[PDB]
Design a protein around this ligand. Structure first.
Ligand SMILES: Nc1nc2c(ncn2[C@@H]2O[C@H](COP(=O)(O)OP(=O)(O)OP(=O)(O)O)[C@@H](O)[C@H]2O)c(=O)[nH]1
Length: 528
């Protein structure tokens, strides 16, 4: 009558395979603040109309958890594959994350209008690699509109409808959020059990905090207030919440008065993985910078930052990101929407250091916090990740060689077809966050894709290198490198500066040191 006519799905596509486009198709084909919890109605060939909820999902590995949550809020997913490219890194990673949630995956080959397009290719891959029936695949072109209905049909027919009870205690999964200046901290939620209407007293199961709902509704696609949200629904909720960290993604929203036995599984707070110091550039100032960050941080529950200063650089901030894209985003967004101009140090992972006389192991986020006294270090550990790569046979050698150089241990190798190779390497994260994205693209003509997952901390032989410009060290220029790779980084970084420094009067001497010892030098002569 209502919840048996509901379809909760999301679009799972690798980078640039058509995810955003196809979404427009669906609304257009159905109609007559970021995009999320989009609700639309559809008249199927079978007769009645259905309530469809399109949940938006992050693409980059940086938001893997958040993607896992978005998936948790659905019954099915459309796995979008570009017929010209085929299965790529994310396509496979996302597939499995979707499988881990028992979602009905509906394959969708897009861009079949392309000359370069090759379906029997993708269908072959789908079967051999994904283990899916090539026959379930939906051929389609979003650029046009070929197969759109064919798609809405698949969703309705193949994807089961929600299955919770609206009479049981409220149980709603938070899969997204954002700060609304007028509504406050808002949470995009999927409702499994019960219902929620304005005025109700909800509670956040991880924190124990209670709030009074002020409004509920969904993107239709405009923020549309409703009288309520029932089991099986997807929408938003407002309850005068101070900020987005109070409604953490993956958290559960029940009733304060009568709560549900347990909370939806898999809650994990935000865990910054990569850090970097951000200093005020040009004429931008510490205050303006400190100000923009406080303004940004409202629309970001993942980011953390603390004041750090340098003798050379001055006053700035040590900021933690989920990964490289998140950081990139935060930068683009700051220089843009805030005008502030910032300089950013090289990124670094959090290290776990055990030093003598200190029972507790210290976590290093800022390299300058790393013990200058090597002998006082009992050991050091750094995060490792499992990197998966997809590439044409031709590029395998250079790639493998690239990986080996950066300390990657090949764990597996296979063929997604006679010309495409699949690879699994175990390498330090510290090595992936440094010129690995460009170098693999450079050597693969942009044809090789890759994804990776954190697989824990492993003890390693790392050291601290210091940078001195004319015999004068720069606290914020020091970095932690593997002892064996030290010389090379020493040299690289040396040249980077030989160029990065603007020729002034005297002679700018640059030295990279390994605990006293100098292992790299670069001196760019005087002024003219
Ligand atoms: N020729 C052709 N191009 C398409 C088709 N679908 C999408 N594109 C184009 O592919 C490019 C990227 O499409 P998007 O919809 O942005 O793909 P996306 O997954 O949203 O990209 P990201 O937002 O980075 O994840 C754009 O030029 C789209 O118009 C298609 O069916 N045929």
């Amino acid at each position: 009558m209502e919840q048996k006519n509901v379809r909760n799905f999301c679009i799972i596509a690798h980078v640039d395979h058509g995810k955003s486009t196809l979404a427009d198709r669906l609304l257009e084909y159905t109609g007559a603040v970021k995009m999320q919890a989009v609700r639309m109605f559809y008249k199927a060939k079978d007769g009645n109309t259905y309530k469809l909820h399109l949940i938006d999902t992050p693409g980059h590995v940086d938001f893997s958890y958040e993607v896992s949550r978005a998936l948790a809020a659905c019954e099915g997913a459309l796995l979008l594959i570009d017929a010209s490219q085929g299965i790529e890194a994310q396509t496979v990673a996302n597939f499995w994350k979707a499988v881990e949630q028992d979602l009905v995956i509906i394959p969708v080959i897009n861009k079949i209008d392309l000359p370069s397009a090759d379906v029997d290719r993708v269908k072959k891959q789908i079967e051999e690699v994904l283990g899916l029936d090539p026959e379930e695949a939906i051929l389609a072109s979003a650029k046009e509109g070929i197969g759109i209905e064919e798609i809405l049909e698949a969703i309705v027919n193949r994807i089961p409808p929600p299955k919770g009870d609206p009479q049981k205690p409220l149980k709603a999964l938070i899969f997204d959020s954002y700060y609304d200046p007028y509504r406050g901290a808002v949470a995009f939620v999927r409702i499994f059990d019960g219902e929620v209407k304005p005025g109700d007293k909800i509670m956040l199961m991880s924190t124990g905090k209670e709030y009074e709902v002020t409004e509920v509704g969904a993107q239709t696609p405009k923020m549309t207030k409703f009288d309520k949200l029932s089991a099986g629904d997807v929408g938003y909720i407002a309850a005068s919440i101070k900020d987005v960290r109070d409604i953490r993604i993956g958290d559960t929203i029940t009733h304060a008065k009568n709560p549900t036995k347990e909370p939806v599984p898999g809650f994990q707070p935000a865990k910054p993985m990569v850090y970097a110091g951000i200093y005020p550039a040009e004429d931008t100032t510490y205050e303006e910078l400190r100000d923009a960050l406080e303004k940004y941080a409202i629309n970001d529950a993942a980011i953390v930052y603390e004041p750090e200063s340098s003798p050379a650089l001055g006053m700035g901030f040590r900021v933690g990101f989920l990964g490289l894209l998140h950081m990139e985003i935060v930068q683009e967004r700051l220089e843009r929407e805030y005008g502030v101009k910032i300089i950013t140090t090289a990124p670094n992972v959090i290290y776990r250091v055990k030093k003598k006389f200190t029972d507790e192991v210290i976590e290093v986020r800022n390299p300058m916090d790393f013990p200058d006294n090597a002998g006082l270090i009992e050991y050091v550990e750094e995060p490792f990740v499992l990197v998966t790569i997809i590439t044409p046979k031709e590029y395998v050698g250079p790639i493998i060689q690239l990986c080996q150089e950066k300390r990657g241990i090949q764990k597996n190798m296979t063929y997604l077809d006679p010309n495409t190779v699949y690879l699994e390497y175990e390498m330090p994260l510290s090595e992936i966050i440094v010129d690995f994205h460009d170098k693999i693209k450079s050597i693969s003509r942009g044809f090789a894709s890759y994804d990776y997952e954190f697989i824990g901390y492993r003890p390693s032989d790392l050291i601290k290198l210091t940078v001195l410009i004319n015999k004068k060290p720069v606290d914020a220029l020091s970095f932690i490198v593997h002892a064996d790779r030290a010389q090379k980084f020493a040299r690289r970084v040396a040249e980077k500066l030989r160029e990065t420094i603007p020729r002034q009067l005297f002679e700018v001497h640059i030295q990279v040191a390994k605990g006293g010892k100098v292992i790299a030098s670069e001196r760019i002569k005087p002024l003219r």
